[PDB]
Amino acid sequence: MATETNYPVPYRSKLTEPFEPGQTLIIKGKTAEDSVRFTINLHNTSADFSGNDVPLHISVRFDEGKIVFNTFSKGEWGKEERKSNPYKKGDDIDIRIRAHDSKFSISVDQKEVKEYEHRVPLSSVTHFSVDGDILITYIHWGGKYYPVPYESGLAGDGLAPGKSLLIFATPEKKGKRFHINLLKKNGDIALHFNPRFDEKAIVRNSLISGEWGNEEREGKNPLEKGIGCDLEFRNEEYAFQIYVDGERFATYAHRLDPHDINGLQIGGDVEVTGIQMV
Q: What is the CATH number of the domain that holds 47?
């Protein structure tokens, strides 16, 4: 219960539109050595009736040692479904819920641990709440099914200095490599981010006038096949600051003038679940 000043519990949010297949709800937070349990609920209502259907109820129990899922509808609860709780009292939590047309896919620490089949209409989800022994540090709802190869323009100012491009993706279980390109109008690639599991390295380069540059690799390579990752490309004064799962992975000195980086391409063996400009 440290400094919250952002998402104080009980937390409740009314969705702009109903939760649709392809969208993900991300909840991150901290727990204390005395935390017992906390909950995440996708539920019905509109104003503040508080008491309608709950398509998906998630209870993370530190006393029981498990994460429990269930649904409430027509005034009754169904049969709970359980999975082990990988967290001990006090560690940070990271739970993500992605909706699909036949179920919810829930990941814990970016690892898929539960497929919860829909028991009531997904369209019934109008709000989401979080309560219990947790201090929320991040919440995001959005995304969609991003086809890959992917290509699109970036806003109007694009990935300008002081801005950051956030990408939520999952390298394929049996994939070998994938890439992300930040481009300029003429086709030059300001930054080519290319994870290569077969080479145990992430290649970084620039494509200028149809020719590839030096090529910068070396570095841990924090990615793992089949596990979700948070990629952040921060455009700074002298270089791009590349963050992977919250830690600075590397820097890449600008080879092309920053500004006007208005293009994005993603390809290779990867699944993309979210793209946002921060």
A: 2.60.120.200
